[PDB]
Amino acid sequence: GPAPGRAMRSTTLLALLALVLLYLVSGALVFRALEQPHEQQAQRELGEVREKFLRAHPCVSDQELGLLIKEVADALGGGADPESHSAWDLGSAFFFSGTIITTIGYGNVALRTDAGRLFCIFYALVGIPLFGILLAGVGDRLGSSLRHGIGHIEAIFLKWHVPPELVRVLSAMLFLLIGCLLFVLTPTFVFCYMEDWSKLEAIYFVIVTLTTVGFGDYVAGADPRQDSPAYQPLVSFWILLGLAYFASVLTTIGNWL
């Protein structure tokens, strides 16, 4: 009814369209000044690296070095450690499978085979939607489990003569802030040391992860090697519950709108 109806009005879209278009333009102008100074430090920057090895070592020709770069190119282009770290063992392959259905897709360990790409194609067409079924399912019992809990302490708020305005003015904020505590503030200060990131990196990782954006610029566990069996299912378990609570909030306020 309202979902197509509010969009059925052509003026609502085209105004929102130009809004989004210029919302993208504004973000591009900001993103430019924030990052343009420091990105392409590789294309021409390696050019000085070659000479600083042609100068540093007269014993090596440029063509010998040119082949060396081309040799290590196909080496790095398939899996090479600049120094066990197998990125396709069942542990990490399970992680890679999860990034597909969650639509996170870090791509930090991309597919090489034309057989693996085809397998992933059908794996995504079927795997992704049925994952959302379970995620929306968990959110049903998860949201109810909080409200069971939300209700118990709610009794105390109303008794202390804070008006029926309490809801809807309070029980929404405390409901989200406890989730903001458990699935954002708690993991960040954990990940701030568990991966030894800075303050913003832990927060930046969580958001891009939970928003299913998944740049792949930040997993850093393995930062060098996965190391511990703690993180492996638990973080995916955190992502799962992170998405579930994320789903609960977007759905509940969907009703309130």
Question: 14 — phi, psi (to 5°)?
Answer: -60, -30
Rounded to the nearest whole angstrom, what is the least distance from the CB of residue 187 to K ion in the complex? 19
- Quick check: 20 binds a second copy (CB under 8 A)? yes
- Quick check: 105 binds K ion (CB under 5 A)? yes
Reported as type and span, the H/E element at residue 158 is helix 114-159
The residue among 20 and 181 lying less far from a second copy, judged by its C-beta, is: 20
Q: Is 150 exposed, middle or buried (CB count within 10 Å of its CB: 0-12, 13-18, 19+)?
A: middle
- Quick check: 252 binds K ion (CB under 5 A)? no
Pick from 13, 65, 92, 103 the residue near K ion by CB under 5 A. 103
- Quick check: 149 binds a second copy (CB under 8 A)? no
The residue among 174 and 237 lying less far from a second copy, judged by its C-beta, is: 237
- Quick check: 107 binds K ion (CB under 5 A)? yes
CB count in 10 Å sphere of residue 175: 19
- The entry of K ion, a second copy, none near residue 200 (CB within 5 to 8 angstroms by kind) is a second copy
- Quick check: 178 binds a second copy (CB under 8 A)? no
The residue among 116 and 151 lying less far from a second copy, judged by its C-beta, is: 116
- State the DSSP code for 9: S
Half-sphere exposure of 196 (CA within 13 A, CB side): 3
Token output for 186: 């708690």
- The entry of K ion, a second copy, none near residue 232 (CB within 5 to 8 angstroms by kind) is none
- Quick check: 139 binds K ion (CB under 5 A)? no
Quick note: the x/- pattern for a second copy over 41-80, rule CB under 8 A, is: xxxxxxx-xx--x--xx-xx-x-x-x-xxxxxxxxxxxxx
Query: Does residue 16 sit in helix, strand or coil?
Result: helix
- Quick check: 134 binds a second copy (CB under 8 A)? yes
CB count in 10 Å sphere of residue 201: 17
Q: Which residues are annotated as a binding site for K(+)?
A: 103-106, 212-215
Q: Is 89 exposed, middle or buried (CB count within 10 Å of its CB: 0-12, 13-18, 19+)?
A: exposed
- Quick check: 138 binds a second copy (CB under 8 A)? yes
* DSSP, residue by residue, 215-247: -SS---TTSS----TTHHHHHHHHHHHHHHHHH
Rounded to the nearest whole angstrom, what is the least distance from the CB of residue 232 to K ion in the complex? 20
Pick from 123, 138, 216, 236 the residue near K ion by CB under 5 A. 216
Rounded to the nearest whole angstrom, what is the least distance from the CB of residue 57 to K ion in the complex? 28
